[PDB]
Amino acid sequence: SETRTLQKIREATQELLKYGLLEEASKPNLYRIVLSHPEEVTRILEPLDLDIGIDEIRGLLYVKVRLDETPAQDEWAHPLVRRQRL
DNA sequence: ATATATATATATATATATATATATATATATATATATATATATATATATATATATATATAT
Numbered sequence: 001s002e003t004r005t006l007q008k009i010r011e012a013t014q015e016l017l018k019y020g021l022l023e024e025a026s027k028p029n030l031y032r033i034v035l036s037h038p039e040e041v042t043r044i045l046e047p048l049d050l051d052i053g054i055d056e057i058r059g060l061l062y063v064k065v066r067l068d069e070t071p072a073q074d075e076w077a078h079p080l081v082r083r084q085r086l
Numbered sequence: 087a088t089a090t091a092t093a094t095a096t097a098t099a100t101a102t103a104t105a106t107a108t109a110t111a112t113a114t115a116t117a118t119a120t121a122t123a124t125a126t127a128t129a130t131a132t133a134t135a136t137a138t139a140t141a142t143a144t145a146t
Contacts, residue, residue, distance in 0.1 A: 077135070085133060 005044075008033045013044055016052070016063060024059030034061060049078060 012030035016022050024031045034041050035054070045051055051066035067076050077083070 079135095082134065 005040075006037075009037055009040055009044075013041060016041075016061065020063050022061040031059070031061060048080065050080075 008029075012022070012034045015027065015030050016034065022031045022034060034052070038052070038054075041052055045063070046066065049066050051064050053062050053064040055061070065076065065078050065081065067078060070076070
């Protein structure tokens with residue numbers, strides 16, 4: 001049917017999901033590949049209500065809930081993320 | 087003819103050396119019951135989230 005996403009993008013996205021972050025000092029290939037395809041990464045993550053926050057100064061990428069603020073409740077609840085309390 | 091007494095005979099008790107068989111003290115090997123340790127499971131609590139059912143405002 002449709003074409004396939006670049007294997008590097010898929011791998012980096014799955015890494016970022018597994019660990020909830022990517023680090024320039026640890027996995028430079030995935031980090032730079034994601035940053036060079038940022039629109040693609042936000043497009044993939046968009047329909048899960050997920051988005052990437054980025055930090056070039058600290059060299060850190062991370063996920064962040066894209067739910068619009070106070071969408072239905074005072075403080076949101078997202079099915080795929082569990083809000084643990086330490 | 088019987089009874090006392092004779093040298094030798096019957097035969098063994100004892101002695102020694104020898105072997106083999108058994109009893110003991112000791113050393114040594116294997117089986118055992120238990121102590122220590124790491125991963126696993128149980129139940130506990132703390133908190134989040136999912137669920138059913140209801141209160142309320144609403145459609146037609």
